[PDB]
Amino acid sequence: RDLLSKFDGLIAERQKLLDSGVTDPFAIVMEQVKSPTEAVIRGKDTILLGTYNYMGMTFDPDVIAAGKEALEKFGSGTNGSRMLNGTFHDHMEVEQALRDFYGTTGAIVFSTGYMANLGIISTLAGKGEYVILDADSHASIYDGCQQGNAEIVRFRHNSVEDLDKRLGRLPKEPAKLVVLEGVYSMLGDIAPLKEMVAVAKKHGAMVLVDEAHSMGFFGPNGRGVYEAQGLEGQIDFVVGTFSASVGTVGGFVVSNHPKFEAVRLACRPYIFTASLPPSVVATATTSIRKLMTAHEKRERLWSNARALHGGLKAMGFRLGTETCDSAIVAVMLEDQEQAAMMWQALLDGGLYVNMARPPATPAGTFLLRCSICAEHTPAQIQTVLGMFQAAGRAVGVI
Amino acid sequence: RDLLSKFDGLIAERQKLLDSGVTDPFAIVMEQVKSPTEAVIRGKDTILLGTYNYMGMTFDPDVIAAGKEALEKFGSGTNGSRMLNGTFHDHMEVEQALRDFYGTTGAIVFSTGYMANLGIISTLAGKGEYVILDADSHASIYDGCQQGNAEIVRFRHNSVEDLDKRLGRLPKEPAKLVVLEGVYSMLGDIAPLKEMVAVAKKHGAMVLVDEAHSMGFFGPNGRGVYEAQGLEGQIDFVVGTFSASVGTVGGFVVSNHPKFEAVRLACRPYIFTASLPPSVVATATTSIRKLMTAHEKRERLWSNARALHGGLKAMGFRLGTETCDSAIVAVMLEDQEQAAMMWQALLDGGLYVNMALLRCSICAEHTPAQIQTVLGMFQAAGRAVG
C-alpha cells in the first residue's frame, strides 16, 4: 500500500464502466472545435450540448481580436501575483468592466472561479463565525468552507423554512455569511432568493450569491437571478466566473461594501498565485462589455432553452425542473447504467452531453446535463430533440 | 460590526503608509509592457527585475504565434472541466509536452500552480496519514495541508537533521508525503535534496518536490534541482507552474507512478474548475518544447545572475546567499522602513524590484548593459538610503 491505494475504488468503478462497453466519459477530446455548438470527437462531427458557453462568446470576432492584440502587445503571461508585478493594463480594465456590468463600486478578479469561492468564503468568515450554505452548493463553495475556520451549517436544498430554522438556532452575536446560488449547476433550478434573503437579513446575516450560471440572461441588465427577483442593493457579495458566458477563464467577486478593497490584502488565493495572462483578461473585458447589450443572443438562448426543456418533457423524460427556469436541462435517469447507455447512444449518434454522478450531483442522482447556448440554430435543436427521442426509446427510458 | 470589520487593522496599516507619502507596493500597474525586461509604470520607463519570467518566454515569436493560432482555431475558452467538455487538442498536447520535458509517463495539468499544490497535497494524504514539509514552504503548500485531513509535521528550514528526527518519531505504517522545494523563492537558496530524499526514503515516505523556480536552467535537461543533484528516478512527484519559465498560467504535477492517472478521478481542484483556454495551453506547449533546448537563454540567465550577485555583494549589500545559486538574488535590509525607502528610490530611478528584503530576479533576456545599469542604480540608492 502507498498514498494512491486509496484510489483503488475509483479505478475499479472506471474500469467496470469501460468493460461494460462504454467510452470513457472522463477522457473525451475535442480534436477540433468549429464553433460554440460543433466539435469533432474521434473523427465524428458532433453537436455540443454539454458546455457553459451560454452566450456563445468564445468565437466572437471582437473578443478574438482583443485576445490576439493583447498577446502581441503584452505577451503570453504576467509572471507574477497581482500584489507584485502581475497587474497590467488589462487586469485593471477587466475589473472596471465588472464594476460597469454589475453597477458596483467593488470588483476583485481571481485566477479561477474555484479560487474566488475558495478565497472569499475562507477569508470573510473566520473562527467563531458561521457559514450557512445550501446543500446543493457547488464543490468550490464547500471547499472554501473546508479551507476556512468558521462553523459550517448546511440547509435543505431550496428550503426557506430550513434556512430560517437553522439560522434561528445559532447564537445572535457572531457574524454570519449565508451562501446561495442563483442557478444551481446540476439540476438547472433557481433559488428563491427573494425569500431566502429576507430570512438571512432577519437573522442579521450577510449574503453571498453565486451567479455563474445566469450572467447576461437574467435581470434587466443581465446581472443574475438576484437582479431578476428585485434584490438590487440587498446582496452583499456576488461571485461569478469568466469561464461560462464570458468565455475565457477566471473568477470574480463584486460588492458595494466600502471596505471591499481590503479583501485583496487578506485573501490567500488572490495573493499567492500568478495573475491571468493579458489575453485572458483582454478577451474577458471585451466579452463582458458586449454582454451588457447582447439582446439578440439573450432572446435566442431563452427560445432554445424553452424548446429543449418543453420537448424533452413532452416526450416523457423526468427532468430536474418542472418548468424551464434556466439554460441547463437535466435529464434524470434511474442508475449509473441507464445514464451511461443513454450517453453512449447520443455520443455515437453525434451529440455530446454531460453525464454526472455524485459528488458533482445531488446524492443518489444519475443525470445527463444538457445546456443550450445562444448560438444553437433551430435546425440543431430539432436534430437534438429527435436524437433524444430515438435514444430514449432505444434504451427504454421513455 | 460585520464580516469586514476584521480588516480594520490592515486598512489602518495601509493608510499609515499612504499618509507617510510612500508608494503603495501592492498597487503597481504595468501600463505598458514592452518586453520581458521593460515596462512603463506611472509614465516612467522602468527595468523589470522583480518577475519570474526566468527564461523570457513571454514575447517569444513562436509562442505568440501559437497563441494566436489557438484563438483562431479553438476560440477564447473551453467552457468546461477537463472531466467533461474542456479537454481540447491542445490540453492533450501540453500534457505530452510535460511527459517529454520531464521524461515521465504521467502528467496532469491544473488551471493554476496554486491549485496543483492545493489539490495534490490534499488528495494524496488522507485521514491518519502525514504531510511533512519545510517551515518555509510556499503558501499554496500550507493551504493544501489545511484543505486536507492529514496530520501535518513542519520541520526546521533546510534542516536534514530535523527532518530525520521528526520522521523517526512517527508510526511506521501510515503512509507519508515529504514535501520539498528545489529553489526557495524568498532568499533564492537551494534545498539539500540529495540528503533530504535519502532521509525520506529511509523512513518509507513518498517525496514531492516543487521545481517552479528551476525550470529550464537546472540539470542537464532543465528539469530542476532534483535532476542537478542526481535524483532522477527517485522523486515520486514533481510539481511545477506554467507562470514562471513557461510564461503563461497554470500548474502541473508529473510522476512515473502507475496509478497516477487516477488522481484525475479524485482531485477536487482538477475536477471542479474550467480547463485553461486553448491559447494558454498552446502557448505553454510551444514554450515547454523550446525550453528543452534553450541553451542560449540558459547561458544568458546564469551570466546575468552571476553579474548581479557578484556586483551587489562586492558593493557591500548583505545578500540571502553567499554564492550565486539561483536566478533569485535577495538583498537583506534591517527594517520594514529601510526596505521601503530602498524600494521607493529604485522605483523612482526606473527599476522595479519586489519588496517582501528586496527580491531581484534576473531573466535570460536582460542584456549586459541592463545589468550594469541596475548595478549603478543599486549603488546610488544604497548610498542615498545609507
UniProtKB/Swiss-Prot annotation, chain B:
Q: How is its activity regulated?
A: Not inhibited by relatively high concentrations of palmitoyl-CoA. Inhibited by both D-cycloserine (DCS) and L-cycloserine (LCS), which inactivate SPT by transamination to form a free pyridoxamine 5'-phosphate (PMP) and beta-aminooxyacetaldehyde that remain bound at the active site. Inhibition is reversed by incubation with excess pyridoxal phosphate. Inhibited by the fungal natural product myriocin, which acts as a competitive inhibitor for both L-serine and palmitoyl-CoA substrates.
Pfam families in the cross-refs: Aminotran_1_2
Q: Where in the cell is it found?
A: Cytoplasm
| GO BP: any one term | biosynthetic process
User: Binding residues for pyridoxal 5'-phosphate, per the UniProt record?
Assistant: G113, Y114, H213, T241, S243
**General function of this protein:** Catalyzes the condensation of L-serine with palmitoyl-CoA (hexadecanoyl-CoA) to produce 3-oxosphinganine. Exhibits a broad substrate specificity concerning the chain length and the degree of unsaturation of acyl-CoA.
Protein name, UniProt field: Serine palmitoyltransferase
Please name the source species: Sphingomonas paucimobilis (Pseudomonas paucimobilis)
